[PDB]
Design a binder for this molecule. Structure first.
Ligand SMILES: CCCCCCCCCCCCCC(=O)OC[C@H](COP(=O)(O)OCC(O)COP(=O)(O)OC[C@@H](COC(=O)CCCCCCCCCCCCC)OC(=O)CCCCCCCCCCCCC)OC(=O)CCCCCCCCCCCCC
Ligand SMILES: CCCCCCCCCCCCCC(=O)OC[C@H](COP(=O)(O)OCC(O)COP(=O)(O)OC[C@@H](COC(=O)CCCCCCCCCCCCC)OC(=O)CCCCCCCCCCCCC)OC(=O)CCCCCCCCCCCCC
Ligand SMILES: CC[C@H]1c2cc3[nH]c4c(c3C)C(=O)[C@H](C(=O)OC)c4c3nc(cc4[nH]c(cc(n2)[C@@H]1C)c(C(C)=O)c4C)[C@@H](C)[C@@H]3CCC(=O)OC/C=C(\C)CCC[C@H](C)CCC[C@H](C)CCCC(C)C
Ligand SMILES: CC[C@H]1c2cc3[nH]c4c(c3C)C(=O)[C@H](C(=O)OC)c4c3nc(cc4[nH]c(cc(n2)[C@@H]1C)c(C(C)=O)c4C)[C@@H](C)[C@@H]3CCC(=O)OC/C=C(\C)CCC[C@H](C)CCC[C@H](C)CCCC(C)C
Ligand SMILES: CCCCCC/C=C\CCCCCCCC(=O)O[C@H](COC(=O)CCCCCCCCCCCCCCC)COP(=O)(O)OCCN
Ligand SMILES: COC(C)(C)C/C=C/C(C)=C/C=C/C(C=O)=C/C=C/C(C)=C/C=C/C=C(C)/C=C/C=C(\C)CC/C=C(C)/C=C/C=C(\C)C(=O)O
Ligand SMILES: COC(C)(C)C/C=C/C(C)=C/C=C/C(C=O)=C/C=C/C(C)=C/C=C/C=C(C)/C=C/C=C(\C)CC/C=C(C)/C=C/C=C(\C)C(=O)O
Ligand SMILES: COC(C)(C)C/C=C/C(C)=C/C=C/C(C=O)=C/C=C/C(C)=C/C=C/C=C(C)/C=C/C=C(\C)CC/C=C(C)/C=C/C=C(\C)C(=O)O
Ligand SMILES: COC(C)(C)C/C=C/C(C)=C/C=C/C(C=O)=C/C=C/C(C)=C/C=C/C=C(C)/C=C/C=C(\C)CC/C=C(C)/C=C/C=C(\C)C(=O)O
Ligand SMILES: CCCCCCCCCCCCO[C@@H]1O[C@H](CO)[C@@H](O[C@H]2O[C@H](CO)[C@@H](O)[C@H](O)[C@H]2O)[C@H](O)[C@H]1O
Ligand SMILES: CCCCCCCCCCCCO[C@@H]1O[C@H](CO)[C@@H](O[C@H]2O[C@H](CO)[C@@H](O)[C@H](O)[C@H]2O)[C@H](O)[C@H]1O
Ligand SMILES: CCCCCCCCCCCCO[C@@H]1O[C@H](CO)[C@@H](O[C@H]2O[C@H](CO)[C@@H](O)[C@H](O)[C@H]2O)[C@H](O)[C@H]1O
Ligand SMILES: [Fe+3]
Lengths: 39, 92, 101, 273, 62, 71, 180, 91, 60, 56, 39, 60, 60, 60, 60, 39, 39
């Protein structure tokens, strides 16, 4: 399969993309909360 | 049969009646599927099922691949007859 | 029962295998077809007898001989039809130029 | 992943539409053009079913009920919240089932198989199309279709039956029931026989077609034989669905009275009127 | 004196546990041919793991 | 158009023709026998002016309705 | 170079492409179970199950049915491939398993499985030629041979049946392409 | 147009019809094999001999008397009228 | 980020994308057309002061 | 931009595209045809101020 | 497989046909809008 | 941590993940859209003081 | 305890664990969302004194 | 005692055990949750003397 | 007695025994749980003098 | 299949894990009883 | 399969992921508890 060097390279994209998606989602919750808080 | 369902307040809501129907329908689904499958490979001896079970030929391979490629999983030439047996038995 | 060759149409009276002494184009067509088939069927039956004689399996030789005799009898039946249609073809004005047999 | 013998079968060709464009697999599944249209209609129909659940009174699986329109809308599309959604889901269903049968035809052509499976499935599609297209069209309103809900469609079946007072007396329904019951009996015998020769008691040799044939002949008095039992099972299972389609399409469009009084013709045959 | 729990419900979950047991058994039987699967990442078994391939004793002579 | 007799076995064309005419004849007879006006086995001896004619317009009374009230 | 096919490209679900003649190499719908046991199928009493009818005197044609022997075989290109000269019978469940065809264009006799023969008019009348939609009359010359002429192994059955099955895709180039 | 395997144009017949292979005691095969052309066109042709043994013989005697009681009560319920027994049979 | 096209066959990622967008677009339009506030085919010419707004019961 | 036709054989796209647009046009017409405001077969002659409005 | 100049030739037709269709559809909407506006 | 991609083919994980996230998001949106408080297509223009709230326990 | 990974392939166990946890989490959330006291999408803004409580045994 | 693990494969027994405990726990929790006395999601905050109790023997 | 393990495989017997005991225990528990006298989840705290009793009178 | 020494090593983990589980479950019943006794 | 050093290595991540997960679940439960206790 992948080389461990290729695993490191993919892991960099994968962690970065995962956290970027979570950052966009955290802003979406900031906006949703400001409009209509659920607690 | 009709009056029994009237007395006991509509047998459609009996969940074992609903299960029995699902197995009655599934028995028709399976024999339609299996009957059609064996006729579609009978040009290759697929109807000689005992021979195909003991000595898998291309007729058994093609019927396994048809269902795998269609719906994502398959039986074997033997085990399809277990599915058949249980669906019929569970109806009653 | 239905005959083999006209089948379902024999219910409606189409029956071209029947023994015909008048000229009839439909019976002539049928006879030319059935002669070629029965000549080939005799040729097959005698090849089969020769093969079984080489193997020497007596009860199979007996049956292959019986089958060949039956195949010859059927061919003779069609050759009789061919000749009687040939006789009629020569005299009935509208008939084929090619022989039937 | 592939079966241990599968790879040599995964050739191009045999498509009806699209050629090489979609002629590939996704996991076990063959895709093809009709695979693409299958996923489209399945997805659109399923999400519109979820939307139907969302605007209805409950998420309880058994109780979700996406109902057809009122009869007053006739053959038009109704307002979406008033049964027009059921109509759009019905178009997706027809597209999904038709795409499935054509994808089965492409798969069978790729394997050099006969077309028996697509056409056998056509029997089920005919019954569905009778229930939601043909019978409602003959009655002049789409609101005669059944609702999409696991138990609410059983309420529809109950009420349609009692529209004819005693639906057991429907003569095509009696035939359809007889096919369904006879099919299930035949399936139990075929399954049992193959298993009992292939899985005999410990230390017994594997059985044979001759033993199967002998036993069956003591059950019914005659030998059905190997291809015969698969012809029978196909005849019974598909005939059950075809006679079902007949029994429902005659109820309403052609016969409107109670079903028991249909049998008046039998009582008045001239030999015993 | 249990109001919600009744014998029909108890029976129905008894059946579900048997039925999901039965589907597992049948899917084990379905894998006696063609498994393990080939994959670019090596063999795959699916789930459940299949029962082993049977060997069949032929009729000794006749 | 007599070349139509070259396109088909004439024995089979007569069988098809006889079938079509026989079936079409029975269709038209049973249609007429089901009508009011041409139920000839019951009403054949009625004079042409006495034979039924389909109404140009039924009447009504405003409170009456042929169908029950709907939803 | 002896691998019968290659991937069409490197993506995970891609088709394979045959490197040679797929009807002969056995790829796609022309493939057979190459591991299948190279012995004859046997009856309950241990005799060969499938044999030419010439070699079992108890068998005969049913009185109402056509005798196929001597009939011409019409191939997918509507040419005459040959004539039937022998029947092979299944002795466990009495039926015709194969026709044996004497080729017109050569000296071979080849087997033709019954599942690949259509009778004219679905057999309702005519009953005087055999129709083989699967392969052209030239392709009959490559039908796989049996090692003997009085018996057939389970492997030979698979090879012969697979050869005709492949013709529905490979007999003409157009058969592989879409209809639209 | 491609052969559908739904119907068999050419049946073959064996002059002998197969018998039962083994264990003939406490019961015996009745009849002998014959061929049906129609059954041989749907499927396999031999209408066979049949097996009963003790359990089969007793089963038929009990089941005959059951059916005889059902039919005679049905026929008594239309006053033994044989025309009404047929005309009204399913009711 | 272009390595996506090495991992996956672009011919069929793009079919999946177009399929996904088409399904999603149709779902959203049928959802809005089911609503009262956004049934544009029948109430589209109403100004926002006339447009429906959903509320709960006044719960006196 | 033209290279999408090296990925997708255009003759096999164009048949698919026509089907999609034919269905889409039929769907939109029927949605309108049985709306109140746009049932033009029965109310097409009204004029824009008389045409129904789905207020409630 | 199609050559790049064949693809380029088709692309010119395919763009032009699409845009011509969209132009005709825009005129159809102009007529529909004039007869009975939806906003 | 990166050796997780020696164990799993990233090409398969991304398919599984995108499938999971797609269904999860559609679930959460439809759940909210079925609620009274967050039926934002009908009631999204209401202020947070105006939005519905479910029933309290009564005090006695 | 690491030799549990010699009994069982970790690649398979993790897929089964991810599957189990996903189903379990969705079950528990749907149980709570079906309740009265924890119908949080409708009544999440209520105080703990205001949230529904199921009835007690009646006093003698 | 350990020879049981020669009669049975521990790989099978351990998965059988996990499945058994999973089912049994879910059965006991759902039976309790369906009761009146232990419907803890609605009534868990009630004190032990406030919690529902089934009716006594009849008295007359 | 141990010849029983020579007649029958203990591996097969142990499964049958555990199956029999598990079913029998579940049957008896749910029979008691369905009774009035022994419905212990609702009424287990009652104490024996005030637990339900089935009707006495043969007469009078 | 296991050697007897492997079975013996497995047995001690299996016993310890069972008793550990039963100990945790014993605390769970101690807590549940303290909150709402069933007898 | 794995070598025992690979099994030893994988376990350390698995334990840490299980711990990290239990920690996040512990905060989630204490937030839920302080919002709306269930006992
Ligand atoms: C009855 C009920 C339902 C139906 C219910 C019944 C059916 C149930 C089906 C069950 C799932 C079947 C899954 C399957 O078959 O997978 C086969 C594949 C086999 O392994 P493989 O051979 O190695 O995989 C192929 C892969 O290696 C190479 O793929 P390929 O190159 O061939 O094709 C590409 C992919 C698509 O590409 C991508 O997904 C990557 C995109 C980049 C993502 C980047 C991140 C974006 C972030 C944005 C954030 C956001 C930014 C804001 O697939 C295809 O091309 C598929 C064929 C073409 C498309 C078909 C036509 C679709 C047309 C209509 C549109 C449909 C729209 C849904 O396996 C895997 O990949 C691993 C397992 C994948 C699991 C997927 C399902 C997960 C569901 C989770 C459910 C969770 C419930 C809560
Ligand atoms: C009503 C009474 C009669 C109702 C009658 C209902 C009868 C239903 C019978 C058929 C159900 C099983 C279908 C099946 O086996 O598909 C193959 C698939 C994978 O295993 P494999 O085929 O041996 O190996 C291939 C795979 O390992 C690698 O393949 P590849 O790399 O090429 O592709 C990617 C992977 C990704 O995996 C998945 O996506 C699997 C997702 C399965 C979700 C659906 C489960 C439905 C369970 C229903 C039973 C019950 C669940 C409660 O593999 C695939 O892409 C495989 C795609 C298979 C698609 C199958 C879709 C079937 C949908 C059936 C829905 C039925 C709804 C009734 O299997 C599985 O994933 C596991 C299935 C295990 C059997 C179900 C047993 C459930 C027992 C109770 C829970 C047990 C918990 C431990
Ligand atoms: C004709 C004889 C019997 C028959 C045969 C048969 N069925 C078949 C086949 C055959 C030969 C197949 O090849 C085909 C198949 O692939 O099976 C695995 C199939 C099949 N029979 C199926 C089911 C089925 N068959 C039934 C009946 C019968 N099938 C007949 C009795 C029934 C009944 C009576 O209820 C059901 C449920 C499927 C498993 C499968 C067809 C799969 C298919 O079409 O897949 C594509 C579509 C989807 C996966 C989902 C579509 C979703 C929709 C877009 C939205 C939902 C709309 C729907 C109308 C809602 C209904 C709600 C209900 C609660 C009312
Ligand atoms: C798995 C569920 C399905 C199923 C299965 C099933 N049924 C079965 C079987 C199986 C697997 C059999 O093996 C068994 C059988 O024999 O099949 C041929 C049977 C059977 N299923 C039957 C019917 C049947 N199955 C039905 C249903 C189903 N069966 C389910 C759908 C139905 C329905 C739907 O209502 C019916 C009616 C029977 C045909 C058969 C059992 C026959 C039997 O028990 O017969 C007993 C004998 C009699 C009633 C007496 C007959 C007497 C005659 C009038 C002759 C009298 C002769 C003489 C006068 C007396 C003797 C004199 C002596 C001196 C000799
Ligand atoms: C091939 C074989 C597959 C078998 C799979 C299992 C499937 C089905 C069997 C189900 C049996 C159901 C028993 C139904 C009777 C029942 O529930 O009556 C209960 C008492 O409780 C009880 O009996 C408790 C019942 C417990 C069930 C335990 C497991 C199943 C036992 C049978 C297994 C047979 C195996 C062979 C009374 O209910 P109520 O409402 O009056 O009570 C409240 C009154 N106010
Ligand atoms: C109603 O309420 C209910 C629903 C009931 C309540 C319950 C809810 C529940 C239980 C929710 C659970 C949620 C959950 C749990 O964890 C959710 C978990 C979410 C997660 C993990 C999301 C992760 C997203 C990751 C993304 C987007 C990654 C993107 C990657 C990118 C962009 C890079 C790709 C690679 C590139 C470009 C380069 C290749 C290089 C290569 C190949 C090379 O270099 O070789
Ligand atoms: C109820 O309300 C709901 C429905 C819910 C609301 C929502 C609706 C939604 C979501 C709608 C979405 C619509 C949509 C989205 O994209 C619609 C997309 C439409 C598109 C893209 C249309 C494209 C049309 C293209 C055409 C016509 C091309 C014609 C080409 C021609 C003629 C030339 C071909 C080449 C030739 C002949 C070569 C000759 C020379 C050769 C060979 C040589 O020289 O060799
Ligand atoms: C509604 O109320 C109704 C239902 C009506 C009321 C009635 C209820 C009834 C009747 C209940 C019955 C209950 C019951 C009956 O039996 C309950 C019995 C329960 C049992 C037996 C539980 C056992 C648990 C055992 C566990 C958890 C073991 C864990 C072991 C572990 C973790 C170690 C794994 C191995 C390792 C790590 C070694 C690796 C190294 C290796 C290999 C190396 O180094 O080689
Ligand atoms: C009706 O009742 C109702 C209401 C339902 C109530 C009752 C509910 C009940 C009964 C609940 C039961 C719950 C339960 C019971 O056990 C729950 C048990 C839960 C458990 C065990 C959770 C465990 C989670 C563990 C996680 C998340 C681990 C993650 C690990 C990670 C991330 C690291 C992966 C490895 C890496 C990265 C290294 C690769 C290196 C490699 C490859 C190398 O080096 O090679
Ligand atoms: C009191 C005892 C009651 C016993 C009841 C017994 C009822 C038996 C009735 C048998 C009726 C058979 O009727 C026959 O049904 C089949 C069902 O496939 C119909 O066949 C129909 O379905 C098949 C598929 O199976 C199609 O290929 C065919 O084109 C179509 O016509 C026949 O056209 C019809 O002639
Ligand atoms: C001058 C008169 C000479 C003698 C005429 C004899 C007439 C005999 C009866 C003619 C009518 C029989 O009825 C007619 O039969 C033909 C026979 O093919 C049917 O014809 C059709 O069905 C049959 C099977 O039934 C198919 O094989 C045939 O291919 C198809 O054309 C017609 O659909 C039917 O209408
Ligand atoms: C609240 C939790 C309560 C405790 C939960 C149960 C787990 C306790 C684990 C820590 C205590 C020591 O637990 C003990 O671990 C050792 C190894 O370390 C296991 O020992 C196991 O492996 C060793 C070799 O390494 C073998 O010699 C031994 O025969 C075998 O059983 C014991 O079977 C277990 O009893
Ligand atoms: Fe079978």
């Amino acid at each position: 399969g992948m080389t461990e060097e290729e695993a490191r390279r993919f892991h960099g994209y994968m962690v970065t993309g995962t956290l970027g998606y979570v950052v966009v989602a955290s802003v979406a919750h900031f906006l949703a909360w400001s409009w209509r808080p659920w607690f | 049969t009709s009056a029994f369902s009237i007395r006991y307040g509509n047998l459609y809501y009996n969940p074992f009646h609903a299960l029995s129907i699902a197995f009655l329908y599934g028995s028709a689904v399976l024999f339609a599927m299996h009957g059609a499958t064996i006729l579609a490979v009978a040009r290759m001896g697929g109807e000689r099922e005992i021979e195909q079970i003991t000595d898998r030929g291309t007729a058994a391979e093609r019927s396994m691949l048809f269902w795998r490629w269609c719906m994502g999983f398959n039986a074997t030439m033997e085990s399809i007859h277990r599915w058949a047996w249980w669906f019929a038995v569970l109806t009653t | 029962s239905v005959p083999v060759n006209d089948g379902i149409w024999a219910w409606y009276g189409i029956d071209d295998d029947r023994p015909m002494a008048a000229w009839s184009r439909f019976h002539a067509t049928r006879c030319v077809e059935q002669l070629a088939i029965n000549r080939a069927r005799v040729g097959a039956a005698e090849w089969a007898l020769a093969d079984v004689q080489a193997r020497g399996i007596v009860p199979c030789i007996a049956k292959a001989a019986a089958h060949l005799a039956r195949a010859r009898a059927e061919l003779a039946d069609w050759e009789a039809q061919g000749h009687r249609l040939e006789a009629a073809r020569k005299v009935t004005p509208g008939a084929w130029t090619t022989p039937v047999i | 992943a592939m079966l241990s013998f599968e790879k040599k079968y995964r050739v191009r060709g045999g498509t009806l539409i699209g050629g090489d464009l979609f002629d590939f697999w996704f996991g076990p599944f063959y895709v093809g053009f009709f695979g693409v249209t299958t996923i489209f209609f399945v997805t659109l129909g399923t999400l519109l079913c979820v939307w139907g659940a969302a605007m209805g009174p409950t998420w309880n699986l058994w109780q979700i009920n996406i109902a057809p329109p009122d009869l007053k809308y006739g053959l038009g599309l109704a307002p979406l919240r008033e049964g027009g959604l059921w109509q759009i889901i019905t178009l997706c269903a027809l597209g999904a089932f038709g795409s499935w049968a054509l994808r089965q035809a492409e798969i069978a052509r790729k394997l050099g198989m006969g077309m028996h499976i697509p056409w056998a499935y056509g029997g089920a599609i005919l019954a569905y199309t009778t229930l939601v297209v043909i019978r409602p069209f003959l009655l002049g309103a789409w609101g005669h279709g059944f609702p999409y809900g696991i138990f609410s469609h059983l309420d529809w079946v109950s009420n349609v039956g009692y529209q004819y007072l005693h639906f057991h007396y429907n003569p095509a329904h009696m035939i359809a029931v007889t096919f369904f019951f006879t099919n299930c009996l035949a399936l139990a015998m075929h399954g049992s026989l193959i298993l009992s020769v292939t899985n005999p008691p410990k230390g017994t040799p594997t059985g044979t077609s001759e033993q199967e044939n002998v036993f069956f002949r003591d059950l019914l008095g005659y030998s059905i034989g190997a291809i015969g039992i698969h012809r029978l099972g196909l005849f019974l299972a598909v005939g059950a669905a075809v006679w079902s389609a007949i029994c429902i399409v005659i109820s309403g469009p052609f016969w409107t009275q109670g079903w028991p009084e249909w049998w008046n013709w039998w009582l008045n045959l001239p030999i015993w009127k | 004196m249990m109001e919600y729990i009744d014998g029909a419900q108890i029976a129905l979950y008894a059946f579900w546990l048997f039925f999901f047991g039965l589907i597992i058994y049948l899917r084990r039987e379905d894998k006696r041919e063609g498994y393990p699967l080939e994959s670019p990442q090596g063999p795959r078994d699916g789930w459940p793991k299949g029962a082993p391939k049977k060997t069949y004793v032929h009729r000794d002579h006749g | 158009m007599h070349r139509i007799w070259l396109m088909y076995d004439p024995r089979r064309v007569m069988v098809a023709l006889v079938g079509f005419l026989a079936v079409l004849a029975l269709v038209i007879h049973f249609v007429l026998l089901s009508s009011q006006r041409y139920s000839w086995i019951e009403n054949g001896t009625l004079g042409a002016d006495q034979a039924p004619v389909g109404a140009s317009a039924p009447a009504a009374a405003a409170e009456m309705s042929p169908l029950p009230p709907g939803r | 170079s002896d691998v019968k096919f290659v991937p069409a490209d490197n993506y995970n679900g891609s088709p394979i492409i045959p490197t040679g003649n797929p009807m002969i190499d056995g790829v796609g719908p022309a493939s057979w179970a190459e591991d299948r046991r190279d012995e004859p199928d046997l009856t309950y009493h241990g005799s060969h199950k499938i044999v030419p009818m010439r070699l079992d005197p108890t068998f005969s044609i049913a009185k109402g049915d056509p005798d196929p022997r001597g009939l011409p075989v019409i191939a997918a290109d509507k040419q005459v491939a040959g004539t039937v000269v022998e029947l092979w019978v299944n002795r466990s469940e009495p039926q015709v398993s194969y026709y044996e065809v004497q080729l017109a264009s050569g000296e071979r006799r080849v087997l033709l499985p019954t599942g690949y023969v259509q009778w004219p008019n679905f057999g309702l009348w005519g009953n005087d030629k055999l129709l083989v939609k699967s392969i052209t009359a030239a392709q009959f010359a490559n039908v796989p041979a049996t090692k003997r002429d009085d018996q057939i192994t389970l492997l030979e059955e698979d090879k012969i049946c697979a050869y005709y099955a492949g013709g529905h895709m490979y007999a003409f180039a157009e058969r592989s392409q879409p209809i639209i | 147009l491609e052969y559908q395997n739904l119907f068999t144009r050419v049946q073959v017949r064996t002059v002998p019809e197969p018998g039962i292979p083994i264990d003939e005691s406490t019961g015996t095969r009745y009849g002998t094999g014959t061929f049906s052309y129609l059954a041989g066109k749907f499927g396999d042709a031999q209408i066979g001999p049949i097996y009963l043994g003790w359990a089969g013989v007793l089963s038929l005697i009990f089941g005959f008397i059951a059916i005889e009681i059902i039919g005679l009560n049905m026929w008594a319920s239309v006053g033994w009228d044989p025309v009404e027994f047929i005309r009204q049979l399913p009711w």
